[PDB]
Structures are given as structure tokens and as C-alpha cells.
């Protein structure tokens, strides 16, 4: 198996064991610490930040009896979100998203989820997580997070992820509003570049959100034995939230496409303006060049040598030529 | 494909019906109960003035103008037995034309 990710900077493992009576968290940089949790009855969350170390992920997978195809999908990043159902586990593939202003680019972090017995396994490509709120929920005993099994932990991870999809959507909304104002006010090169970049980002966001909707539909409809009957409505709610996200993405995509083609309409008039400029200067200054080049010959006998006041006469002729060429324009408002 | 059910909206409490359009200026209820021999007209604002028309033995045409008032939509739907998802469809104007058959 090979790892095809851009980030290789850091590796760090956080485990969080939570139960009704008490919870335990223990950050570490080793591997054998998380191994005994395969026999733990209480729910436990294994968060392996740093997927570059293929040795540790291979060891963890071997200790958990998982198929090597799951390993080669976990190390692979450039794939759409997908869900796998198996007799002893369920495999979830999800993508995070980061947005920054002053430079409109989307960063997608591939995160994979493995759920088996009373543990959840996740694999972050890079440091930087979505799941803080569930962390303070488990640590400070908020809600019903600590009264349930690992299926509820899977639900918590997934709906935290869709919540930050909502945050991404609001950032994109502000950008689309300002870009609409900019295009309707004054379009130039950077406005068109921003519009194209926004269209590309919306393409990526759509191609990510739709498979996630399919994943959630499978989760709450296939009702696998690993997920209890009580946990279905929560996944159903997450599915509805994904529907909201997809509808907003489609609306934003249509808006951006309209912004693009309204600008792309007006190329030909700019062509006319530029070519009219070219034509007016060329038509003014080629006859002038001919006039100023004919008298430039170095012939032994030259008629204007005998002529008197040659400069005023020639420059007057050239100036009136320029004037008559200029007034030849403006007939249909060339200038 | 799936049994009908109210959807979950992230920014709203669970049992919320929201008018999705943008018109909030007009509200009136107009009825034209008619039969072979006699017909009657009256516009009104009280919603209880039109509910006893559910059990009319002759055709009646209740015309509610202004659905920003989710009060009247919800009350009429609850009195006439309309399912909450149908009320959600009525209030959602970002929609395509469709027909649904109930019992």
C-alpha cells in the first residue's frame, strides 16, 4: 500500500475512552497503547492524526481484522466520499474543507471512518480537526453522548462535519454577494478570475456533497446491524441537512454561471473598440509616414532645395491631411 | 419510494412550518359557496368563519390569499385533516408543480 497525500508534517495519536461512569483520554505518539482497546466494552474514539506513517495504520488494521482493500482506500485520498457495509464493520469516507479569504482556494482533507464493536476508528490526513464540539460534549458530559454506544459517536462525527459544511456555505455566500456587487459595478480581469475560481470551488463542493448525501441515505436506510434502530432518526436528520447543503450549492452554482455568462456576452464590442483604435492611428500615421519618407530621399538633385519656406508648406499639408482623416471618422462615432 | 415525513432543518426548531416566499403584504379569505339554485359570497379575515364550510353538502371554494400567515395555513390544515408535509409543501414556494393523491 502507498500513501498519496500532500501533507506529511506531523503524526500524533489521540484516544478518548468515555463511559457512563467516567471517561479517559490519553494522547500518545506510540501505537501499542491503542491496541488493548479492541477488547474494551465501553465506547472509545481512536483519532490517528497523520496518515503518512503506513506502518502504524497497517499495524492498527491488522490488529482489528480489517480488509487490505480498506487500507488502500484509507491511504488513498483522491476519491469521492463513499460508504462500505461489511459483516463486522462499516467503512465511511468523508472530506473536510478549509476556506481562507484574500485568496479563494478550497482545501479538502480526506478523513476515513471505521466503526466496529464499541469503537470508532478515524484517519486524518493532516492535523486540524472538525470535531471539537463533540470533544467538549464527551469531556464535560453534555447531552446524551456518553449514554450511548459508538454508533452515536459516528453520528456525532458526521453531523459535526456537516455543520462545518454549513459554515463553509455561509463563507461562500458572503463571497458570492461581494462578487455579484463587483461584477455589476465594475468588471475587469481579477473579477473574472475570481468568478472562474468560485465556479471551480462550487464544482468541487457539489461533487463532494452529493456522494455524502448518498452515504447518509445508505446509513439510515440500509439499517445495518452495527447501527441500532434507535440511531436511525439521527442519521435521517443529518441526511436532511445534506439535502439543505446540496440545494444551496445548486443555487449558488446557477448564480455564478449567470455572473459569468453576462460578462462573457460583451466581448465583441471590446473587439470593435480596440480595432477602431488600431485603425484610426494606423490610418492617420501611414499617409503621414509616406509624406515624410518621400522627401527623405538623398537624391543629388531635389526639387524642394530651390523651394522656399519648405517646412511650413509640408507641415501644413501633413496637418490638413491629419485633420481631414480625423473628420473622416466620427461619422458613426468611431472615436 | 419512502414513507412521508417532515424533514429536519438545521436552523429551525423541529416542529416549525416556515413560509418560504417573499410576499407579506396581503391576507384575506374569500369563499363562494354555490349550489344549483343559490350562491353566496363573503370575504373575511376570521379563519373560524370558513371552517364550518368543511361539511357543506354543496360545492364551496375557499380562497386564502396570503400564506405568509402560517397561522391560517396550519389551522385550516389541522381542521381539514391535511398532513403536515402537505402544509410544508404549500408553504414552500421554491418548488415545481406536482400532484399528490391521498385517501
Amino acid at each position: 500500500l502507498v500513501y498519496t497525500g500532500k501533507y506529511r508534517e506531523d503524526f500524533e495519536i489521540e484516544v478518548m475512552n468515555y463511559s457512563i461512569e467516567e471517561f479517559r483520554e490519553f494522547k500518545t505518539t506510540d501505537v501499542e497503547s491503542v491496541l488493548p482497546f479492541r477488547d474494551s466494552s465501553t465506547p472509545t474514539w481512536i483519532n490517528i492524526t497523520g496518515i503518512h506513517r503506513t506502518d502504524v495504520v497497517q499495524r492498527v488494521g491488522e490488529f482489528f481484522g480489517i480488509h487490505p482493500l480498506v487500507l488502500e482506500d484509507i491511504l488513498n485520498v483522491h476519491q469521492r466520499p463513499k460508504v462500505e457495509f461489511f459483516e463486522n464493520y462499516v467503512f465511511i469516507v468523508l472530506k473536510m474543507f478549509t476556506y481562507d479569504k484574500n485568496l479563494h482556494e478550497l482545501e479538502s482533507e480526506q478523513v476515513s471512518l471505521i466503526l466496529t464493536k464499541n469503537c470508532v476508528l478515524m484517519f486524518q490526513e493532516k492535523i486540524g480537526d472538525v470535531f471539537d464540539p463533540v470533544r467538549e460534549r464527551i469531556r464535560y458530559n453534555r447531552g446524551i453522548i456518553r449514554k450511548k454506544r459508538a454508533d452515536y459517536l459516528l453520528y456525532s462525527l458526521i453531523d459535526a462535519l456537516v455543520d462545518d459544511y454549513f459554515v463553509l456555505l455561509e463563507k461562500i455566500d458572503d463571497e458570492i454577494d461581494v462578487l455579484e456587487e463587483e461584477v455589476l459595478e465594475r468588471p475587469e480581469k481579477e473579477t473574472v478570475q475570481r468568478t472562474h475560481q468560485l465556479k471551480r470551488n462550487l464544482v468541487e463542493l457539489r461533487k463532494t456533497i452529493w456522494p455524502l448525501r448518498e452515504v447518509l441515505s445508505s446509513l439510515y436506510r440500509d439499517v445495518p446491524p452495527l447501527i441500532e434502530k434507535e440511531t436511525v432518526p439521527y442519521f435521517r436528520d443529518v441526511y436532511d441537512h445534506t439535502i439543505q447543503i446540496a440545494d444551496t450549492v445548486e443555487t449558488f452554482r446557477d448564480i455564478v454561471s449567470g455572473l459569468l455568462d453576462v460578462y462573457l456576452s460583451s466581448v465583441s464590442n471590446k473587439t470593435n473598440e480596440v480595432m477602431k483604435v488600431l485603425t484610426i492611428i494606423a490610418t492617420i500615421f501611414m499617409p503621414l509616414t509616406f509624406i515624410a519618407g518621400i522627401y527623405g530621399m538623398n537624391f543629388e538633385y531635389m526639387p524642394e532645395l530651390r523651394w522656399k519656406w519648405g517646412y511650413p508648406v509640408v507641415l501644413a499639408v501633413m496637418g490638413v491631411i491629419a485633420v481631414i482623416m480625423v473628420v473622416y471618422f466620427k461619422k458613426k462615432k468611431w472615436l | 419510494m419512502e414513507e412521508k415525513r417532515l424533514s429536519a432543518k438545521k436552523g429551525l426548531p423541529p416542529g416549525t412550518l416556515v413560509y418560504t416566499g417573499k410576499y407579506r403584504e396581503d391576507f384575506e379569505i374569500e369563499v363562494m359557496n354555490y349550489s344549483i339554485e343559490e350562491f353566496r359570497e363573503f370575504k373575511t379575515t376570521d379563519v373560524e368563519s370558513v371552517l364550518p364550510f368543511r361539511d357543506s353538502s354543496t360545492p364551496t371554494w375557499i380562497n386564502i390569499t396570503g400564506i405568509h400567515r402560517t397561522d391560517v395555513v396550519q389551522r385550516v390544515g389541522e381542521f381539514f385533516g391535511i398532513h403536515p408535509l402537505v402544509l410544508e409543501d404549500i408553504l414552500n414556494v421554491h418548488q415545481r408543480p406536482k400532484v399528490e393523491f391521498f385517501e
Partner: antibody
Amino acid sequence: EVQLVESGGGLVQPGGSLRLSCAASGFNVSYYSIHWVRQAPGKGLEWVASISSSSGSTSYADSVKGRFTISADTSKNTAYLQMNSLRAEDTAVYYCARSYWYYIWSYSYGNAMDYWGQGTLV
Amino acid sequence: DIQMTQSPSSLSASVGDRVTITCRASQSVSSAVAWYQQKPGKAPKLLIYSASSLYSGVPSRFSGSRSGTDFTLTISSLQPEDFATYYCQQSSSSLITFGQGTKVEIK
């Protein structure tokens, strides 16, 4: 026709408890969300808490959360706000407001306070 | 807590002239911004919701606009019945917040 009337405001010893009543008229509380917004003298408006009587969903301001509790009953068609462990900064004109939800995009909804009470000083 | 910053704190204007206020959001509020007016010793009245939608029964001189996280309330021409404090409210989150107000005094 539609109007909100609030009551239950007055003097109280700091550290004590108080309750405010909001009476509805011309509308049904079960179909709307009721907010309390206070305004201390010399300062501006400050949202405190809200409730949706249909489901019981409730939110409190961070500076208010923990001690206040807002409730309502469709039978009496009134909204209540329990003010526990009052402090010197909680003195203000307390308002009752009805709001509706409007639509922006499929992911974002708004909230506008169209009808207001009259204010009860505490 | 999403803080709405509203400027100017106090404004003086002449009747019949154009007056504008600005409310700046600290966070990304989508479009859920409402403007209210409050004459002293009175309850607030809704003027504009959704940052550009005018409440029914409000004069057309009141207008709202949005440019990203910048929301502006404008009155085309002031009137004697138009001097009060104006508030901007965000309702993107369940913990809705107000501004600090903006007074309009006759000049």
C-alpha cells in the same frame, strides 16, 4: 388586533427571584416564537431568551443563561420568564416580542421581530 | 456571540436630507439582518428585515443594503417623524444580538 402585554415587573432584592408574564392576544403562542429583550437605562437593546411553544425549543443569552428559564403554555396562551438569582446588572425594561421566520437560502433562515410588548421595568 | 458594530454612535442631520448608517458584522451572518427604530419611551418597530426587505407599512424612504458583512440603513429624505435611535440585529444564530444603536438628532 394582535398585541402583547407583559407584567410581573417591579422592585426585588438582589439575589432573589422574580417571574414575568407575557399575555397574548390576536395570535396563538403555539405557532410563534416569543423572545425577551431587555434594555437597561442609558444603554441599548439586549436579547435575553426565546422559546418556541410548539416544541419547547429554548435559547438563552450567554450572559443570562443558567439562571433564567423561559416557558409557555398554549392553554393560557402566555409566555413566562423566571428570573433567578438576580444581580445589579439585571435591572432593565424587559420587553416581550413575537417573531416569524423568513427564508434566505436553503441553509440559512432569518428571524424578524414584528410585534412588541410595552415593557415592564425590573 | 456575534458582535454587530454600528456607526456612527450619534448622528445629526437636517430634515429632507439623506442619512445613512452602517452595521458591520464580526462573523459571517448570511443575510439575516434587521433594522429597528425606537423613539424614547416606546417599543421598537421593525423597518427592514433580510437586509433589503421592507416591512409592510413602512415608508419607502427607508432602504437596506448588504455588501458582504457590511449592512447599511439609509433614509432617502428625513422627516420630523423620523428622529429616533436605530438598531441593527443579526439573527443568523439562535443567540441573536443587537448593535449599540445610532441616534438621529435634528440639526
